[PDB]
Design an enzyme around this catalytic site. Structure first.
Site, short mmCIF file in Angstrom:
data_model
loop_
_atom_site.label_atom_id
_atom_site.label_comp_id
_atom_site.label_asym_id
_atom_site.label_seq_id
_atom_site.Cartn_x
_atom_site.Cartn_y
_atom_site.Cartn_z
N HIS A 18 0.52 -1.66 -0.24
CA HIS A 18 0.08 -0.16 0.16
C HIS A 18 0.49 1.48 0.14
O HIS A 18 2.01 1.45 0.49
CB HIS A 18 -0.77 0.39 1.40
CG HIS A 18 -1.48 -0.87 0.68
ND1 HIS A 18 -2.91 -1.05 0.88
CD2 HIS A 18 -2.05 -2.48 1.82
CE1 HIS A 18 -3.78 -1.92 0.37
NE2 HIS A 18 -2.95 -2.69 1.22
N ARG A 74 19.59 -12.03 6.76
CA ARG A 74 21.04 -11.89 6.10
C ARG A 74 21.71 -13.13 6.19
O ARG A 74 20.93 -13.83 6.21
CB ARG A 74 21.77 -11.03 7.59
CG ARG A 74 20.37 -10.18 8.03
CD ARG A 74 19.81 -8.93 7.66
NE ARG A 74 21.56 -7.65 8.27
CZ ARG A 74 21.02 -6.67 7.81
NH1 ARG A 74 20.29 -6.30 7.23
NH2 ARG A 74 22.25 -5.79 7.83
#
Ligand SMILES: CC(=O)SCCNC(=O)CCNC(=O)[C@H](O)C(C)(C)COP(=O)(O)OP(=O)(O)OC[C@H]1O[C@@H](n2cnc3c(N)ncnc32)[C@H](O)[C@@H]1OP(=O)(O)O
Ligand SMILES: CC(=O)SCCNC(=O)CCNC(=O)[C@H](O)C(C)(C)COP(=O)(O)OP(=O)(O)OC[C@H]1O[C@@H](n2cnc3c(N)ncnc32)[C@H](O)[C@@H]1OP(=O)(O)O
Ligand SMILES: CC(=O)SCCNC(=O)CCNC(=O)[C@H](O)C(C)(C)COP(=O)(O)OP(=O)(O)OC[C@H]1O[C@@H](n2cnc3c(N)ncnc32)[C@H](O)[C@@H]1OP(=O)(O)O
Lengths: 186, 186, 186
Positions: free
Chosen positions: B114, B179
């Site tokens: 959005h 990560r």
């Protein structure tokens, strides 16, 4: 020589598409389906289903609806066990849970895992490592427990935690990864 | 001028309450419902439903029950695809998945998003960004994939990870945010 | 003296197995079941059910299927409310949601909690703390909201976030734990 089911329980590499295991997984989903289709006032029925599903059940038990299991018989639970909405138990190996343990919604206990190497993984071989939870443990909402994890007595795991290492008794543990932030009176 | 469906697929702003899209979303939920109501031994039936649902399917495929989709046709999957319990595919845009990819339970792939600005958001405008997953990828339990993410070949995403940036091939990646912690042999 | 229901709403310690509360929880699951069993084109029916379920509902509302609640009446929602797939509302206490708020899939709002002390916890006593969400708020997928959290207006919570502290208005907040990373124009 070991069967695929035996390799599975012993933490060795096994092929999940083994005929015996596939049909045990089918039997599990039948009880699971029966459990999740029960009406809100059918406590007696749900309790019976859990005693057929789980490896061991205490005197009293309450598991809120939409439960997810792989085999069921590897799930061993103590007295006054509570599991809230939408908990997932991937019990490829033993998920041993002590007394007075309560699970918040969306708690996910995974014992299964795959080889890091792609060729090994693409061959279909798979592993498991049992998960242990001690007595008097409150597990927060959306908590994920990884394979081979042991959680001691008197432990509070905060919501959204990802348990990757063992959690000592008498502690409060939160975070991703999950670490101890407090000790508590025994 | 573009239609709302066209704006959607092209990563532009569109109104989801467009009549065509609403009825495509209805068609999706019908197949989804049919899929999730099947019995544990109806592999043939589930497989057929997936071939009507998904944009493209390989020779073999296994998706465990309670699947969640928006449109279905934006989901393109390779050979020997596996999706465990309760995976969610918000395929506003293309979710392209390679060969020998397996999803653990509760994996959530979101392509929709959005506007940051409230007035834009309150107007009903909405966006999408396609998600790409390479060949030979194991995705851990409860992993969330954000819009516009590409995941290379030979990647293992640890449980509870939140993929916010692209993950290179031949790596192991965990955490929130996700990560790389290890490289691996090709 | 207070009843168990009164202790609950007031943030005090209560016994959940209270007969009144158990039968209110039963009534909730009946509406929930009716809601989740509706067909994809039964918007009118779902909307009616939500008006019986929730404490307060605006003119327009859309909640995607498989909703999870405890009581329902503690859920107060503003105008144009949107809740996507598989949201969980543990409304032991008040979950007050403002106008133009939209929830992504798998959003979990927990107001309930347990005593840290095991003896207190094993006695069956339980607590609640209300959750507040302001106007114009986009909540990302798989976001967990802990008891006693207030979220201001104009807030975007990133996917996979675990809200443990209050989030100020006009901010973007992500992470586990959830922290502000950006401010935004009002
Ligand atoms: C009916 C049933 O089945 S239960 C239903 C409810 N489901 C739930 O998941 C509720 C679980 N409750 C929680 O997770 C709570 O956050 C608790 C119990 C862990 C809080 O414990 P506390 O130690 O008192 O938290 P407290 O507010 O004192 O502060 C703890 C610190 O760690 C952080 N923290 C607390 N909880 C979390 C969490 N879940 N994740 C990450 N960080 C957390 C706090 O931000 C705070 O950080 P700081 O002091 O360094 O700035
Ligand atoms: C049938 C099916 O569909 S599969 C079903 C199972 N579902 C799952 O989600 C299981 C996924 N398995 C995992 O997530 C595992 O944790 C694995 C595979 C990522 C472990 O990989 P490893 O690299 O071997 O982890 P390892 O134990 O060696 O240590 C990794 C480090 O990163 C951390 N770590 C490992 N996994 C995670 C994780 N999921 N999240 C956060 N941190 C993690 C460890 O704490 C450790 O930290 P440190 O060494 O700096 O102290
Ligand atoms: C139809 C419906 O109901 S909506 C369906 C979709 N569901 C969803 O959950 C989608 C939500 N979208 C997100 O979460 C996005 O990540 C957004 C909106 C938060 C991105 O906002 P942005 O501020 O523009 O992210 P941006 O890419 O600019 O970078 C933000 C930084 O924080 C990090 N970050 C962004 N999102 C997250 C996250 N969800 N969790 C952890 N870290 C994050 C980024 O890694 C980046 O780190 P760095 O710059 O320090 O290296």
């Amino acid at each position: 020589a070991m069967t695929e089911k035996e390799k599975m329980l012993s933490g060795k590499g096994y092929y999940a598409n083994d005929e015996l295991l596939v049909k045990e997984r089918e039997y599990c989903k039948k009880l699971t389906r029966l459990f999740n289709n029960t009406l809100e006032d059918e406590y007696e029925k749900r309790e019976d289903i859990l005693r057929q599903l789980f490896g061991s059940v205490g005197k009293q038990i309450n598991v809120e609806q939409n439960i997810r299991c792989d085999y069921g018989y590897n799930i061993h639970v103590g007295e006054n066990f509570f599991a809230n909405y939408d908990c997932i138990f991937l019990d490829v190996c033993k998920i041993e849970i002590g007394d007075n343990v309560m699970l918040a919604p969306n708690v996910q206990i995974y014992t299964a895992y795959h080889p890091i190497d792609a060729q090994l993984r693409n061959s279909g071989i798979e592993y498991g490592s049992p998960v242990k939870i001690g007595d008097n443990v409150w597990i927060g909402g959306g908590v994920i427990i990884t394979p081979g994890i042991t959680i001691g007595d008197n432990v509070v795991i905060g919501a959204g935690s990802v348990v990757t290492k063992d959690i000592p008794p008498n502690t409060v543990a939160v975070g991703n990864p999950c670490r101890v932030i407090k000790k508590i009176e025994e």
